[PDB]
């Protein structure tokens, strides 16, 4: 497995869970991120997307760009893209992968909005968020990598 496989694994595993009991994570951006963090053992601010962004802004390291965000995810860190909204905010997990338009990283996220706000790693943050918002995203990274060493039994090239 890749060094960052635990991030994608936690995303896949969180999709059909219901962090808010009764509401599938695919239909709840905050719940999706909470379930990913819980699987990885990363403490996370509580509440709706806006409250979570408030908490991340107060306590997490912020990255300078979506490119940096993908780079940190590739090293096995949990990286959250977030933006507050006047009514509802949105949060997503950034994963390694090619940058859309040379700028916007791939992501996983659920959304009460439905399919337009959902990504199972196949949309970038620049496709999920509005054109008026995608250049205003905040990227937060946890202080320690969540993934472990590869299995000791792994045979690989030198």
From Swiss-Prot:
Active site: 29 (nucleophile), 90 (proton acceptor)
Main location: host cell
Entry keywords, A to Z: Disulfide bond, Host membrane, Hydrolase, Membrane, Secreted
Entry GO CC: extracellular region; host cell membrane; membrane
Compartments in which it is found: Host membrane; Secreted
Effect upon mutating residue 90 to A: Complete loss of peptidoglycan degradation
GO terms, molecular function: amidase activity
InterPro entries found in the cross-reference section: Papain-like_cys_pep_sf
EC code: 3.4.19.11
UniProt entry tagged with the keyword Cell division: no
Top-rank taxon, per record: Bacteria
Cysteines paired by S-S bonds: 6-147
Reactions performed catalytically: Hydrolysis of gamma-D-glutamyl bonds to the L-terminus (position 7) of meso-diaminopimelic acid (meso-A2pm) in 7-(L-Ala-gamma-D-Glu)-meso-A2pm and 7-(L-Ala-gamma-D-Glu)-7-(D-Ala)-meso-A2pm. It is required that the D-terminal amino and carboxy groups of meso-A2pm are unsubstituted
Family matches, as Gene3D superfamilies: endopeptidase domain like (from Nostoc punctiforme)
Subunit structure: Forms a heterotetramer with Tsi1 consisting of two Tse1 dimers and two Tsi1 dimers. Formation of the complex inactivates Tse1 enzymatic activity.
Free-text function comment from the UniProt entry: Toxin secreted by the H1 type VI (H1-T6SS) secretion system into the periplasm of recipient cells. Degrades peptidoglycan via amidase activity thereby helping itself to compete with other bacteria. To protect itself, the bacterium synthesizes immunity protein Tsi1 that specifically interacts with and inactivates cognate toxin.
Protein name (Swiss-Prot/TrEMBL): Peptidoglycan amidase Tse1
Native organism taxonomy: Bacteria, Pseudomonadati, Pseudomonadota, Gammaproteobacteria, Pseudomonadales
